[PDB]
């Protein structure tokens, strides 16, 4: 119910009516202000509470980032309060995987959004780390949808859909999802798995992502990548202390919220180095 707190956090100043332009402006403000991060699962802190109060406490009041369940959870509550009709969906991540790869777990969550006067439903995803669409996408197959960054495309895959994006020089399948509404409890089960399981990439490693000035800032451990329209520059971070500095400065995460910096640096040192 802390609508004001959220809007100030994302530095939004426009209108609040449930329209297409507002949805575009909110998604752009959210993706540019709240970083993607897995500092909680990395530090052995599970992501179990997906209520409006818990997510606003962390992502707004404490100035932290989060992952898919936290990002799409928070924006989903905000949009519902503004008058948008929000349906929470579940997805399986297939990024960089070939078509014959083993069936992935349902560890991603996206939103199907409608509003007064809309021609059709819209896909909203502000929680897909390094490749999250910075614009609401028409929930329709075949159409190429250009954003402020990469172009996106949805295609019909079996009993559901698949979101694809043109990364570098080829169309890459990001995730496959069903358009069926999933209850909150199913999302909690998925979030528990991805934040506690010893095999999860969010437990074993560090991942951080943001968007700032027509560019994508992606961090995989000590590997920082800045993806621009022109090209990509890669920076190999020297030590765990420099990694924490990047998380605080470049990514705008309140690192002090995690606890003693020495413990976070030691965890990054043992995991990334
Ligand atoms: C919650 C899952 C999530 O945020 C994610 C999965 C796979 C790749 C990027 C982000």
Author numbering: 3 to 275
Paste lines from the article.
NAT utilises Pr-CoA in addition to acetyl-CoA (Ac-CoA) as an acyl donor, both of which are products of degradation of the alkyl moiety of cholesterol. Arylamine N-acetyltransferase is one of the novel targets that plays an important role in cell wall synthesis and intracellular survival of mycobacteria within the macrophage.
The crystallographic structure determination was performed by incubating MMNAT with 1 in solution (15∶1 inhibitor to protein ratio in the native form) and then to crystallise it (co-crystallisation). According to the proposed mechanism of inhibition, this method is expected to allow time for the ligand to mature into the covalent modification of the active site cysteine with the 3-phenyl-3-oxopropyl moiety (POP). The crystals diffracted to 2.7 Å and data were processed as described in Methods and in Table S2. Upon refinement of the co-crystallised complex MMNAT-POP, a continuous excess electron density connected to the active site Cys70 was observed, consistent with the proposed 3-phenyl-3-oxopropyl modification. The binding site of the fragment which was observed attached to the active site cysteine was accommodated by the fragment predicted from the MS studies using a 1∶1 ratio of compound 1 to MMNAT. Therefore, we propose that in the presence of an equimolar amount of the inhibitor, the active site cysteine Cys70 is the residue which is modified. Extensive dialysis of the enzyme after incubation with compound 1 was completely ineffective in restoring the activity of the enzyme, supporting the proposal of tight irreversible binding of 1 to the NAT enzyme.
